[model samples]
Target: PDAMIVIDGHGIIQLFSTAAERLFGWSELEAIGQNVNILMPEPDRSRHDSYISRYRTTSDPHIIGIGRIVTGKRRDGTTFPMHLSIGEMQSGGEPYFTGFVRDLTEHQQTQARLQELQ
Candidate 1:
């Protein structure tokens, strides 16, 4: 409920929900206007440019319609698994990508706790 980051069409962080700031050790002021890749892992951080470039040039759809499970990297360089669902829409003739993310760590832990109780 607390850990969520919201970014806008320009990839600028619009909201660093309280939980996310605590989790990532970042203040909203520090993260706002920064590229979203600031939160990406190594290879992804390096390769994101090409990925966006290709999509822009070809107008191809990759993660637009479909949802995917991906890894998220923290400011401490730790990686965690997450399920990401992406949706796209057009506003004022410009395209926007909205990604909804769910962290699997808590879910797994909760499942383990339930099993233990059982």
Candidate 2:
């Protein structure tokens, strides 16, 4: 979360933004060429391939998502909450997916604090 990541049709990492490195503790060299699911916590990690496969076969909009709260696994195996928006497009006639993420650990905590004060 709090970063931008681009993946290919096969769910392989293509672009790993600097902000992503800070968020996920992955250097670009370490992230690129790895399955994008490496950043996802399981259940998500296990289901990601199936979701993409279904989308490719059925063209499901939900697979790209419309901004949802998800979970991410960091390099140190710590799991965190993230808000993610998935967008799909094509480049040079090949499909691409762009993920926009926002880490929600502090944001969610702030909301809880405000609710308690109210």
Candidate 3:
């Protein structure tokens, strides 16, 4: 259950946990120092830079402190649903973002099974 990912204000991944590798199929060495958007699906993947830029320029908030369900794309192009929570903080006089993600595949499957049993 030890999973965590730290990203900078620019959306560059700073730290990728071991659990992240198991879940996302990317090694820490491969993920770290890369754009966090690598895990996002297309369109979102392509527009992530703009979104972050807008956030930085307008100081407008969207997902920060507002956790929501989103989709993640694996290296093989397989997509899965995940819940994301983001926290904003400062480091070295620069802003940073920390995202905590939870994969919903198993949870949703369990829910479906329970409904069938009922």
Candidate 4:
């Protein structure tokens, strides 16, 4: 299963689903008004706001619709690999993004173990 998050044009979280609470260790109440970057790590966390700005201004999408693997930072300060897929939509003429994140820790570990057998 995947955790779902929705952010407004300004990168403010509008919705934090139940699955997100479980995955990120933050209750919906805590995550609702925060920037989506709270779930990101390091350079990505610092650069996330700018990334949203670039896309809105240039209409050039980096991760919208296309999915990729990235690292997620939990509330406990733990990091894990995840696959993230973003979908773009509009409401009241403002852009919104819905992110679906799936944890990949076990999947990657399995791959690594299989390689070790070679």
lDDT of 2 by residue, 12-99 (tens): 9999999999999999999999999999887889789888878889986783667788889899999888988899989988898999
Which 10 successive residues of model 2 have the least lDDT summed? 60-69
Question: Model 3 over residues 1-118: C-alpha lDDT tens digits?
Answer: 4357898888899999888888898999999999989998888998998988899899888998788888887778789888988788899999888888899878878989999999
Query: What's the lDDT of the predicted structure labeled candidate 2?
Result: 0.89
Across 18-102, the per-residue lDDT of candidate 4 in tens digits comes to 9999999999999999999999898999899999999988988788867899999999999999999999999998888999999
Clashes of 1: 0
Each candidate structure's count of clashing pairs: 0, 1, 0, 0
Best by lDDT: 4
Q: Against the true structure, what is each candidate's TM-score?
A: 0.69, 0.89, 0.86, 0.93
Better of 3 and 4 by lDDT: 4
lDDT for every model?
0.70, 0.89, 0.86, 0.92
Best by TM-score: 4
Model 4 is weakest, by summed lDDT over 10 consecutive residues, at 59-68
Model 1 agreement with the true structure over 1-118: per-residue lDDT tens digits: 6466555555656666766677666788887777777877878877765765677679786776776777777787888777766566566786555556677878877889999999
Cα shift from native, residue 12, model 3 (Å): 1.1
